[PDB]
Amino acid sequence: FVIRGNEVSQIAPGQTGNIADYNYKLPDDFTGCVIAWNSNKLDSTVGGN
Amino acid sequence: STPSALGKLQDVVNHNAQALNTLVKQLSSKFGAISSVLNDILSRLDPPEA
Incomplete structure (x- = not known):
């Protein structure tokens, strides 16, 4: 999944x-x-994901 | 008349009963735990720490 x-x-x-x-x-x-890594490159938008 | 004539059997009774009393006191003990009642620990503490 994708979380904070x-x-x-x-x-x-x-x-x-x-x-x-x-x-x-x-x-x-x-x-x-558990493996967690930053996904701001793909799972983030300028308008708010 | 004398209060120490039956000392041995009275000592046996005292030893047994007070061993049980020591047990029930251990029930009201901590051994490093927060409290002496498991329900209190469950109520106040989260399951991962409870």
């Missing part, structure tokens, strides 16, 4: 938050990885 950069703390394994409760809940025992 500062919201990574909200997608921590077993984290609780408004997006973590109503958008995408990661499991408390998540056994994997």
Whole structure:
């Protein structure tokens, strides 16, 4: 998906938050990885994406 | 008359009952945890830290 950069703390394994409760809940025992990189080059517009 | 004639059995009873009392006191203990009731920990703390 595409999210805000500062919201990574909200997608921590077993984290609780408004997006973590109503958008995408990661499991408390998540056994994997997360790779995040800036997408302002393609997923951002001057008029507001 | 004498209060120490039955000392051994009274000591046994005291030891057992007070071991149980020590247990229930451990129930009201922390061991570094915030509180002594699990429901309180769940209510005040988020599940990742609870």
